[PDB]
Amino acid sequence: TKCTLKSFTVEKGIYQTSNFRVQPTESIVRFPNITNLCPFGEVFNATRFASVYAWNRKRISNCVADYSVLYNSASFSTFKCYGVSPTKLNDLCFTNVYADSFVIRGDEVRQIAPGQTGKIADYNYKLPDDFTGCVIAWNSNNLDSKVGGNYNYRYRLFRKSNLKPFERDISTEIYQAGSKPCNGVEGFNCYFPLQSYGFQPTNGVGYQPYRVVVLSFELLHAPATVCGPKKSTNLVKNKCVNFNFNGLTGTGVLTESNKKFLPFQQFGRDIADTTDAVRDPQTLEILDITPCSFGGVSVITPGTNTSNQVAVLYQGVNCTEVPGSNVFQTRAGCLIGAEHVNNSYECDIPIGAGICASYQSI
Amino acid sequence: QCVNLRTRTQLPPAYTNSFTRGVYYPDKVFRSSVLHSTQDLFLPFFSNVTWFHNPVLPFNDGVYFASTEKSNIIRGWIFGTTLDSKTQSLLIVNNATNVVIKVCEFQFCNDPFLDVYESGVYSSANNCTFEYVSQPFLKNLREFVFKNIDGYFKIYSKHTPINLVRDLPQGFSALEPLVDLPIGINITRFQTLLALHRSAAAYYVGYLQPRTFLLKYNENGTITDAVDCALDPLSE
Ligand SMILES: *[C@@H]1O[C@H](CO)[C@@H](O[C@@H]2O[C@H](CO)[C@@H](O)[C@H](O)[C@H]2NC(C)=O)[C@H](O)[C@H]1NC(C)=O
Ligand SMILES: *[C@@H]1O[C@H](CO)[C@@H](O[C@@H]2O[C@H](CO)[C@@H](O)[C@H](O)[C@H]2NC(C)=O)[C@H](O)[C@H]1NC(C)=O
Ligand SMILES: *[C@@H]1O[C@H](CO)[C@@H](O[C@@H]2O[C@H](CO)[C@@H](O)[C@H](O)[C@H]2NC(C)=O)[C@H](O)[C@H]1NC(C)=O
Ligand SMILES: *[C@@H]1O[C@H](CO)[C@@H](O[C@@H]2O[C@H](CO)[C@@H](O)[C@H](O)[C@H]2NC(C)=O)[C@H](O)[C@H]1NC(C)=O
Ligand SMILES: *[C@@H]1O[C@H](CO)[C@@H](O[C@@H]2O[C@H](CO)[C@@H](O)[C@H](O)[C@H]2NC(C)=O)[C@H](O)[C@H]1NC(C)=O
Ligand SMILES: *[C@@H]1O[C@H](CO)[C@@H](O)[C@H](O)[C@H]1NC(C)=O
Ligand SMILES: *[C@@H]1O[C@H](CO)[C@@H](O)[C@H](O)[C@H]1NC(C)=O
Ligand SMILES: *[C@@H]1O[C@H](CO)[C@@H](O)[C@H](O)[C@H]1NC(C)=O
Ligand SMILES: *[C@@H]1O[C@H](CO)[C@@H](O)[C@H](O)[C@H]1NC(C)=O
Ligand SMILES: *[C@@H]1O[C@H](CO)[C@@H](O)[C@H](O)[C@H]1NC(C)=O
């Protein structure tokens, strides 16, 4: 009081010093049930993969996919992410995904990389230098390699030019290395552009078959498809907290409400555009929001010239959230530091709602 | 298996009165016993709605579709710009079991028709992008509102059992949202789909315009009455 009045002495009366408000305790987030998972079991646990120059292409959109669980798996030899790190990949997302899967040798595992050149990198699969996405490779010697030789797999060896990024060519035309034309039969200057892999169970690391899947992403102006799932902590009521219900954020205290939302609304507001009720995306029940309590504080003093003990009034605040004497609850708020009597005298220092205080103690 | 017909589908282009039909929920916000003024694309009151008794028609900003259906002859809708494989085409079909929505570069015949004894209105379907299946939509009045804003296709619907003889009833009935599609297309024209036996249909079509309405919400959150704010001066 002395500081607000900027004086060393105070006369009798009531003065307004500062304000008061409840502080939020913790945070909660609510999101609907996680379902419609993207089916990667048929991709990364597929029995058979295609050739390197005939790589299988899969389009991914309109589902939910979690990349943390895939990243945590130790069954993948190479997990190289270029555009983004695997940790933060679960947050950001794209409007479509392309998965290119094939099988190569273990010595060619680094051919599939931005700014990389080679036989496979120029004749079978090509990536842009600015490619964004991830590459996952894993040995499949016990599965893809055969004791009789995995000659089913094929690779492109001969081509006049290179391959454009994200281009697949399965043409089997007889390559013409020289100038001599060939009538569909390879000659001195003609060779088959395609050669079969020679995998065996015992061939060594580098010659072992390796399944490689490359995930690429694109962000066309279409609405966003699959993103990482969102966690949902449980809800707590009757406590001043801040909430993020499905993108609707705000502070307050949450209670049970008897309003009846018609089956397609999400939340309600009363007037002047202030939200009052919400519907939790999981339990599908109507809640109620009430702002956390606040109000000004005032000090009642008989004057520095007489005493030095004072009483304190919190305006419009229930006597349940106070933070050493008797406490009185009045229609004007809550009062601490003064004693309530049954008499009735002439009013000295107005307080309100028909009551007032005076000095005798206060 | 699509063959053009000999007789012309020259349905009469009659006109009739819109009255106070075509009011839908602008959003998903609950309000109780309050008057709220909102500006959006609506069908103006007492407008001139066209009556057909199936040419390509423009889409404009939105479309209001209504049908006094008897025995479910209408079956679907076709949306697009060039109506061929050059541009993405939206196809909506409602057969007995479910409803199918596809976004593909279909090659439609000049006189599409569903056939009865599934789909034979398109020669081929290539480069498909979006697919969707859901529950069937359907002496009944079927009202639909189609809107397309920023790569979002909004479909609102309402069914009403009516017994009046000829014209649209003098009453109020709001349209509740039905489906939203997150697909980016720039539709400009549309069509109707009929499943007719090889061996003459009536509906009503109107267009939407931007304007402001005053809406009344009762205690339970249902729209019960509306006022057009650009009409006779009493409304203003
Ligand atoms: C999300 O999934 C949970 C898990 O099943 C659902 O919770 C179940 O709800 C039913 C309906 O009353 C109860 O009979 C079960 O006992 C609940 N089980 C659990 C573990 O909570 C919940 O309803 C789902 N929410 C949706 C689909 O919105
Ligand atoms: C301050 O909060 C308490 C606790 O909610 C209120 O006491 C409630 O009063 C209502 C009305 O008589 C009763 O129905 C509840 O059972 C009471 N709760 C408890 C725990 O006793 C009190 O009324 C509030 N202060 C004011 C001025 O209303
Ligand atoms: C109505 O259309 C639906 C959608 O295509 C049909 O249901 C599918 O029919 C095919 C053809 O046998 C099946 O392969 C699908 O599994 C069916 N889908 C579902 C969800 O069951 C249905 O058969 C059609 N009915 C008629 C009478 O044409
Ligand atoms: C066939 O579909 C593909 C993809 O579904 C289309 O490729 C798109 O072409 C546009 C044209 O500029 C690009 O902006 C997009 O980035 C491409 N990829 C997409 C949309 O994923 C292709 O145009 C389609 N072909 C035809 C004839 O419609
Ligand atoms: C709005 O909701 C209220 C609450 O249920 C409805 O009121 C009930 O209506 C039924 C049938 O008309 C009666 O049997 C109940 O006795 C009513 N209860 C109460 C508390 O009013 C009301 O019908 C709904 N519609 C309107 C227009 O008010
Ligand atoms: C493949 O199967 C293994 C064995 O259960 C499992 O751990 C892994 O998550 C599966 N991967 C996919 C993509 O389904
Ligand atoms: C209160 O004020 C009066 C008049 O100024 C003075 O006589 C009296 O001493 C004061 N009381 C104190 C200083 O305790
Ligand atoms: C007097 O005051 C006390 C405490 O202030 C209170 O408990 C009591 O009800 C009041 N009335 C009587 C008649 O004692
Ligand atoms: C529609 O306009 C025509 C003339 O273009 C008019 O004859 C008819 O009455 C109008 N219908 C209405 C206003 O419902
Ligand atoms: C539709 O065509 C217009 C030009 O006519 C173009 O600006 C717009 O991008 C097209 N829509 C989509 C989704 O590409």
Residue of B nearest to A262 (CA): B221
For B234, residues 6+ apart whose C-beta sits below 8 A from its C-beta are none
Domain presence at residue B143: yes
CA angle (B67, B69, B74) in 5-degree steps: 80
CA of A31 to the centre of ligand 1 (A): 14
Q: Are A83 and A76 in contact (CB under 8 A)?
A: no
Nearest-CA neighbor of A4 among A295, A297, A362, A322?
A: A297
d(CA A331, CA A166): 75
Smallest Cα distance from B217 to chain A, Å: 11
Task: Retrieve residue A159's tokens.
Answer: 């081509």
Experimental technique behind these coordinates: cryo-EM
Phi, psi of A68, deg, nearest 5: -65, -45
Domain presence at residue B6: no
Domain presence at residue B8: no
Which residue in the set A260, A264, A268 is minimally distant from B31, CB to CB?
Answer: A268
Residue of A nearest to B220 (CA): A260
The helix/strand/coil state of A250 is strand
Contact check, Cβ <8 Å, A271/B152: no
The upper half-sphere exposure of residue B50, i.e. CA atoms within 13 Å in the direction of its Cβ, equals 15
Contact check, Cβ <8 Å, B177/A266: no
CA of B226 to the centre of ligand 5 (A): 22
Domain presence at residue B1: no
d(CA A281, CA B206): 37
A41 lines ligand 6 (CB under 6 A): yes
Chain B residues in contact with A289 by the CB 8 A cut-off are: none
Chain B residues in contact with A277 by the CB 8 A cut-off are: 30
A344 lines ligand 8 (CB under 6 A): no
Beta strands B62-69 and B140-149 are antiparallel
- Which residue range is the domain that position B154 belongs to? 13-236
d(CA A343, CA B20): 68
For A82, residues 6+ apart whose C-beta sits below 8 A from its C-beta are A114, A131, A132, A133, A134, A135
d(CA A313, CA A13): 13
d(CA B50, CA B68): 14
The helix/strand/coil state of A2 is helix
Chain A residues in contact with B220 by the CB 8 A cut-off are: 260, 262
Which residues in B have their CB inside 8 Å of a CB on A?
25, 28-32, 34, 130, 151-152, 176-177, 182-184, 220-222
Domain presence at residue B4: no
Count of CB atoms situated within 10 Å of the CB of A1: 16
Domain presence at residue B46: yes
Q: Where are the alpha helices (DSSP H) in chain A?
A: 2-5, 41-44, 67-72, 86-89, 119-123
d(CA B103, CA B80): 10
Count of CB atoms situated within 10 Å of the CB of A317: 21
Q: Are B90 and B103 in contact (CB under 8 A)?
A: yes
Q: Do you know the residue count of chain A?
A: 362
A340 lines ligand 8 (CB under 6 A): yes
Q: Are A273 and A306 in contact (CB under 8 A)?
A: no
Cα A214 to chain center, whole Å? 23
d(CA A92, CA A105): 33
d(CA B68, CA B59): 21
CA-nearest residue for atom 26, ligand 1, is A282
CA-nearest residue for atom 27, ligand 2, is A318
Task: Retrieve residue B38's tokens.
Answer: 């909102």
d(CA A151, CA A161): 25
Domain presence at residue B158: yes
B236 lines ligand 5 (CB under 6 A): no
The helix/strand/coil state of A108 is helix
Contact check, Cβ <8 Å, A264/B32: no
Contact check, Cβ <8 Å, A262/B220: yes
Domain presence at residue B3: no
Ligand with minimal distance to A220 CA: 4
Q: What is the DSSP letter of A70?
A: H
Contact check, Cβ <8 Å, B31/A269: yes
Residue found by looking up tokens 């943390």 in the block: A68
For chain B, give the DSSP string: -----SS-----EEEEE-TT--EE--SSEE--SEEEEEEEEEPPTT-EEEEE----EE--SEEEEEEEESS--EEEEEEESS-STTS-EEEEEE-SS-EEEEEE---B-SS---------SBS---S--EEEEE-----EEEEEEEEEETTEEEEEEEEEE---SSS--SS--EEEEEEEEE------EEEEEE--------EEEEE-EEEEEEEEE-TTS-EEEEEESSSSTTT-
For A210, residues 6+ apart whose C-beta sits below 8 A from its C-beta are A77, A103, A104, A105, A106, A109, A137, A138, A139, A140
Residue found by looking up tokens 């507001």 in the block: A269
Q: Are A224 and B184 in contact (CB under 8 A)?
A: no
d(CA A298, CA A302): 13
Phi, psi of A5, deg, nearest 5: -75, -10
Contact check, Cβ <8 Å, B130/A223: no
CA–CA distances in Å: residue A71 to residues A54, A66, A97, A138, A140: 26, 9, 17, 13, 18
Ligand with minimal distance to A341 CA: 8
Which residue in the set A62, A260, A266 is minimally distant from B28, CB to CB?
Answer: A266
Q: Are B15 and B51 in contact (CB under 8 A)?
A: yes
Cα A189 to chain center, whole Å? 58
Q: Are B176 and A264 in contact (CB under 8 A)?
A: yes
d(CA B24, CA B40): 11
Task: Retrieve residue B39's tokens.
Answer: 């500006």
CATH code at position B171? 2.60.120.960
Residue A338, by phi and psi: left (phi above 0), alpha (psi -120 to 50) or beta? beta
Q: Are A151 and A194 in contact (CB under 8 A)?
A: no
Nearest-CA neighbor of B220 among A274, A286, A289, A249?
A: A286
The helix/strand/coil state of A106 is helix
For chain B, the domain total comes to 1
Phi, psi of A98, deg, nearest 5: -120, 130
The helix/strand/coil state of A89 is helix
Substitution candidate for ligand 10 out of B153, B186, B187 with most atoms within 8 A of CB: B186
Q: Are A247 and A31 in contact (CB under 8 A)?
A: no
A220 interfaces chain B, CB cutoff of 8 Å: yes
Beta strands B29-30 and A267-269 are parallel
The helix/strand/coil state of A292 is coil
Phi, psi of A89, deg, nearest 5: -65, -30
d(CA A330, CA A354): 10
Phi, psi of A37, deg, nearest 5: -75, 140
Chain B residues in contact with A222 by the CB 8 A cut-off are: 151, 182-184
d(CA A190, CA A192): 7
Q: Are B49 and B198 in contact (CB under 8 A)?
A: no
Chain A residues in contact with B28 by the CB 8 A cut-off are: 264-267
Nearest-CA neighbor of B122 among B103, B95, B146?
A: B103
Cα A23 to chain center, whole Å? 26
Ligand with minimal distance to B217 CA: 5
Ligand with minimal distance to A219 CA: 4
For B137, residues 6+ apart whose C-beta sits below 8 A from its C-beta are B94, B99, B157, B178
Measure CA of the first residue to CA of the last residue in chain B; give whole Å: 56
* Helical (H) or strand (E) element with A242: strand A241-245
Residue A83, by phi and psi: left (phi above 0), alpha (psi -120 to 50) or beta? alpha
Residue found by looking up tokens 């103690």 in the block: A361
CA of B229 to the centre of ligand 10 (A): 33
Q: Are B202 and B69 in contact (CB under 8 A)?
A: no
Contact check, Cβ <8 Å, B29/A269: yes
A222 interfaces chain B, CB cutoff of 8 Å: yes
